[PDB]
Amino acid sequence: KKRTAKKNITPYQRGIIRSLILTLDCSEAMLEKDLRPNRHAMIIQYAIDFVHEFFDQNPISQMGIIIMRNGLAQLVSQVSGNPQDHIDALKSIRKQEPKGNPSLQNALEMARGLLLPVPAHCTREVLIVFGSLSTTDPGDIHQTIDSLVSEKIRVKVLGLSAQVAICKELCKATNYGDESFYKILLDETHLKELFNEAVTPLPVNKINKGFTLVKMGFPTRIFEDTPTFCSCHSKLVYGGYFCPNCHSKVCSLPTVCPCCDLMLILSTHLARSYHHLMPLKTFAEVPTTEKFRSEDCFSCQSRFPXXXXXXXXXXXXXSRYRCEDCKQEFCVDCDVFIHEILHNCPGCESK
Amino acid sequence: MKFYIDDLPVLFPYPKIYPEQYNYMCDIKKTLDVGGNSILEMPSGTGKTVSLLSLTIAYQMHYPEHRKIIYCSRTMSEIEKALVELENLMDYRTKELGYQEDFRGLGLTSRKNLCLHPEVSKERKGTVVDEKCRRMTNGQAKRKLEEDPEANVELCEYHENLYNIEVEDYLPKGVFSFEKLLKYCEEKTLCPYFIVRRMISLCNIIIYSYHYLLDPKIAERVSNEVSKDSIVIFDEAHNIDNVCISLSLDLTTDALRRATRGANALDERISEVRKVDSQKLQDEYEKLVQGLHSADILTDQEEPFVETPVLPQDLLTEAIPGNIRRAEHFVSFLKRLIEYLKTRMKVLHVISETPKSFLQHLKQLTFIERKPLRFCSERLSLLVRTLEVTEVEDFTALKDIATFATLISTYEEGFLLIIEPYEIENAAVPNPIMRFTCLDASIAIKPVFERFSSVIITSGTISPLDMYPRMLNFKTVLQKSYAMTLAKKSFLPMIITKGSDQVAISSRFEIRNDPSIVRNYGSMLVEFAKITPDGMVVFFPSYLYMESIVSMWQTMGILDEVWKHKLILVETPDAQETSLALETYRKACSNGRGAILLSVARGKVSEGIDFDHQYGRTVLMIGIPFQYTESRILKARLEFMRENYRIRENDFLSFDAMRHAAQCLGRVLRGKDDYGVMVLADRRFSRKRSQLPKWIAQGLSDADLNLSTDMAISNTKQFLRTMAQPTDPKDQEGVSVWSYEDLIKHQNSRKDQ
Numbered sequence A: 001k002k003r004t005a006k007k008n009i010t011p012y013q014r015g016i017i018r019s020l021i022l023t024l025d026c027s028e029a030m031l032e033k034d035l036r037p038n039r040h041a042m043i044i045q046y047a048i049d050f051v052h053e054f055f056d057q058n059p060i061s062q063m064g065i066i067i068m069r070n071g072l073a074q075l076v077s078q079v080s081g082n083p084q085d086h087i088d089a090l091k092s093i094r095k096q097e098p099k100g101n102p103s104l105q106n107a108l109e110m111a112r113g114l115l116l117p118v119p120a121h122c123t124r125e126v127l128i129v130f131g132s133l134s135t136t137d138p139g140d141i142h143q144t145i146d147s148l149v150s151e152k153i154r155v156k157v158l159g160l161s162a163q164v165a166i167c168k169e170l171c172k173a174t175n176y177g178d179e180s181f182y183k184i185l186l187d188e189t190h191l192k193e194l195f196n197e198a199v200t201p202l203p204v205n206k207i208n209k210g211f212t213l214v215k216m217g218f219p220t221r222i223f224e225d226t227p228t229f230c231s232c233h234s235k236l237v238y239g240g241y242f243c244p245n246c247h248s249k250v251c252s253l254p255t256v257c258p259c260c261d262l263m264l265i266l267s268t269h270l271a272r273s274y275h276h277l278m279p280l281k282t283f284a285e286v287p288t289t290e291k292f293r294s295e296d297c298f299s300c301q302s303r304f305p306x307x308x309x310x311x312x313x314x315x316x317x318x319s320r321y322r323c324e325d326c327k328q329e330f331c332v333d334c335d336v337f338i339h340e341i342l343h344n345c346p347g348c349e350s351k
Numbered sequence B: 001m002k003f004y005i006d007d008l009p010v011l012f013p014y015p016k017i018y019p020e021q022y023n024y025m026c027d028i029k030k031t032l033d034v035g036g037n038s039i040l041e042m043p044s045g046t047g048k049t050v051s052l053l054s055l056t057i058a059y060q061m062h063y064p065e066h067r068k069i070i071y072c073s074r075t076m077s078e079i080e081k082a083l084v085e086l087e088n089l090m091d092y093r094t095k096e097l098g099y100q101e102d103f104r105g106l107g108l109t110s111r112k113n114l115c116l117h118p119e120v121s122k123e124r125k126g127t128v129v130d131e132k133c134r135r136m137t138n139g140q141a142k143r144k145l146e147e148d149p150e151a152n153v154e155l156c157e158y159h160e161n162l163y164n165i166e167v168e169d170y171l172p173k174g175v176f177s178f179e180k181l182l183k184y185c186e187e188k189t190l191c192p193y194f195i196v197r198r199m200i201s202l203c204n205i206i207i208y209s210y211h212y213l214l215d216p217k218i219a220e221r222v223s224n225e226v227s228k229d230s231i232v233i234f235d236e237a238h239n240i241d242n243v244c245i246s247l248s249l250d251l252t253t254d255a256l257r258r259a260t261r262g263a264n265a266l267d268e269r270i271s272e273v274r275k276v277d278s279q280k281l282q283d284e285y286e287k288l289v290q291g292l293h294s295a296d297i298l299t300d301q302e303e304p305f306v307e308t309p310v311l312p313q314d315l316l317t318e319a320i321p322g323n324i325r326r327a328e329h330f331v332s333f334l335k336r337l338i339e340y341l342k343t344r345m346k347v348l349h350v351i352s353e354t355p356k357s358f359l360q361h362l363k364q365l366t367f368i369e370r371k372p373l374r375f376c377s378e379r380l381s382l383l384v385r386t387l388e389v390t391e392v393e394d395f396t397a398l399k400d401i402a403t404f405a406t407l408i409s410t411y412e413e414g415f416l417l418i419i420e421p422y423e424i425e426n427a428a429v430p431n432p433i434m435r436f437t438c439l440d441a442s443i444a445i446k447p448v449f450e451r452f453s454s455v456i457i458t459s460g461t462i463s464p465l466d467m468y469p470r471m472l473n474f475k476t477v478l479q480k481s482y483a484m485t486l487a488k489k490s491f492l493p494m495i496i497t498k499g500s501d502q503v504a505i506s507s508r509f510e511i512r513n514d515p516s517i518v519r520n521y522g523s524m525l526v527e528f529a530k531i532t533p534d535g536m537v538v539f540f541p542s543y544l545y546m547e548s549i550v551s552m553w554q555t556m557g558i559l560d561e562v563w564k565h566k567l568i569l570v571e572t573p574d575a576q577e578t579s580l581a582l583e584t585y586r587k588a589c590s591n592g593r594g595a596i597l598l599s600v601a602r603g604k605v606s607e608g609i610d611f612d613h614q615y616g617r618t619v620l621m622i623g624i625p626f627q628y629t630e631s632r633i634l635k636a637r638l639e640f641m642r643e644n645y646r647i648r649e650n651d652f653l654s655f656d657a658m659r660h661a662a663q664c665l666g667r668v669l670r671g672k673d674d675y676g677v678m679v680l681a682d683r684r685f686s687r688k689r690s691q692l693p694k695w696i697a698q699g700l701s702d703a704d705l706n707l708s709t710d711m712a713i714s715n716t717k718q719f720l721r722t723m724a725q726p727t728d729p730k731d732q733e734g735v736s737v738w739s740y741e742d743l744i745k746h747q748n749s750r751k752d753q
């Protein structure tokens, strides 16, 4: 009655400052009806949610879009920080329809240049949503794959209802051999979290360069809405932040400094991570007889957690998934939820 | 690993291990001790070779008695397959248990592969390769090299320097696979063709084509060191029968005519030399008048011109060829021969002649005698040996006559000569085929089989295990069919008896286009071509039969659509083009974009090559293979086969097609990592479920019977999707992958009964 990601073992290192380029196949292959309007629509559909979902857990990570039609790599959205720009770029395409084959080889190389500008710390990383069963590669590939590795470009693909060796090779090679990234869905619902699991950072057993100090500053809000002006959109922004150093206005964002070129976040963006940094050991289910704790949830307050002797119901499930490190109990949904939304183990918080 | 089979450490080189392998080795060792023949169905989807070599190597090095090993292979591909295999097992043997091994073993393949001197290495035909590599180091030519070293003498030059250093003991210790051997011998300038030829005398394990064990003219130099009683391994020998049929002999009259002039060229040669240097020829007569001249009728260090088409230098006699002792007597009767043959050449219709029936008939139309008839070859052999000719292509034909003569002198009543007046394919033209053929495989099998009781045979596709003991009459012990153990799908078989229109699809109907089937077949192919990722092959019952399908499909709009998805590669009759094409097909499969290949089950592709995961994900058996496209050759052979053995053509027929049908499929899987889809496309397969190799039919489920395309495509559609999941339980694999040194300890301690 359990399927648990046993140990939260980075254990000490995960890739926070990310630079993810999402690439989508846009081919007639995407026009087959396994998915309702097509795969392609559900894709762009499921892509949309992803963006916030991404930017939610990653308010510090640039991102851009690529489509693959007519055997062509065709950037749609410059890699940037705002979600909305990215977000809108989809719907536009979402109505348009794919044409011609997918040229994977075109894809990566356009990325390979695309991911060059980002700093060293930024995880240079790509994600693929392949739809076809083969490719149309204008040039070599096995050589091309290697070039990625030379650039330390992790990749990950979301295979369609099949497996193709080359990408299966691609992930394996590009994740320094150690592979898990060639996931291909078997069910649509799987695809849902398939995006969601892509949200988090992604080390396993890493090699360690010099991970340096990251210079950055913090802006401060303004008051006079009338005095509107701007310095990144040059519009009349009612009034916003100011560089701690450049000391110039900026449209509200976690943006970089359009005046003296540095990263400017608040802090919450940092805070948004830390649950990614040190997550929690799962709350453990309890014995069918040994619990004998209060007849009321701790986190929540639900009287049950058992059934007070109900033949094949009370002994059926010790509804007492409970924490170890604080050794205090917890409700069913609570542990479902405290592991989900806010992590912050209450029992382990208060002692 | 290093465990016990109740008597022997098992220096297993693969940490993970499969229960069948032990189930395998357990039985063969049992068979190893108490001599037997006792074939074994072994699903090669696992490592059968390691399972073999594991038991063997220790058993050689554990017990003291049998210091030699004989492992016979279908082809050099098998050779090189096994060569690297043992080498790493052998290398693992040094890594884990020091070095107490002193074991060397290698395989001879040919001149053409092993002729390292670039001259004939450029040249193609092995006989010419045989001719010049002879002329490289030939008894006359080496005498031309030693007695009269001249510009007419060209050589590999290695067999000299090889002889300089090599022939006192081996190169140091390696089981030098061609990868290792071809380089290593190049550096020290060796054509290892002679390295092994001398090393014949040394190695404790050997590997070569069944011919080298069965082709008597090459399987002649059998020595007690190389043979006496050691262990025999026949791997993938499901098709051994057809190999024994070796004693095949058909008569290209056109080549035969060239032989006549070659005979005259000989006739002129002997006459002209008897004019000039007849004394040593008379001395050869004196080398003849003594008796058999065993000194140089058998021993020739680089000379022997004609091979021994007879069994390995046994079926001969000693009484001289009477008069023919005089070559002029001898030359004359040879002309009697060809002319008799030439006389027999132009029979209006097909005529089948049993040897004895033909025997006096020879004497009838020309009073020749059988006793000289065998003597021809050696008498010829010395004759050309005495005259150091500049070519053999003429004389190949000549010796073939002698070879024919010897053969027809040799055997009877199990063998027969038939002359169709032509090839009926383009009938009513002059091209008669004085075909004299073997009929019983076992006869050629008997001798080597007679020698040693440590005889072992196994293919990945032996089915059924009865015909071979039936056909060869041989005395087996145990024949166990090995159910492949799977805790998972691991592959998919399918049967398409009918299409979407439920129209039964076949090939026995004709070699022609019942347009329903092929139009149905375009669909079948294309939808599959769509669904699978790269790597897919199809097989056809016959080349030109396939040609029909293609041509019509080419006309239809079928091909272009699949051209959209995958890449297409046909099979060719020539090997060269094929050989090129194949590697590309590998490259496309290895590369991203999908591809597809077509060939024929009887084809050389189906015989040697192998298909892994990317290289093969789906196969297709278009139709059920058959051969009565051809003539009584089988039937006349069937006569003896059927009249003696309680076998009907169908018995032979229905099995042998399967003997070739699954023969393709075994290549589809290499490691238990791999998987694939195996479809069958013919109505009659439904009746044919009961002839498969056991592990196949076990892998075959009932509901897959007489599937149509629609029902088929779903299962693959899932199976592909399903298998593509990282289906890694990593816990139930204890039973199926036998927790290493522990569960084999555990379960076989529990399997102690």
Ligand code: SF4
Pocket: B111, B114, B115, B116, B117, B118, B120, B121, B132, B133, B134, B136, B137, B155, B156, B157, B158, B159, B190, B191, B192, B193, B194
């Ligand atoms: S001498 Fe050696 S290398 Fe040269 S042709 Fe003969 S076998 Fe080949």
Ligand SMILES: [Zn+2]
Pocket: A230, A231, A232, A233, A234, A235, A237, A250, A251
């Ligand atoms: Zn602005």
Ligand SMILES: [Zn+2]
Pocket: A243, A244, A245, A246, A247, A248, A257, A259, A260, A261
């Ligand atoms: Zn600034």
Ligand SMILES: [Zn+2]
Pocket: A323, A324, A325, A326, A327, A328, A345, A346, A347, A348, A349
């Ligand atoms: Zn806690």
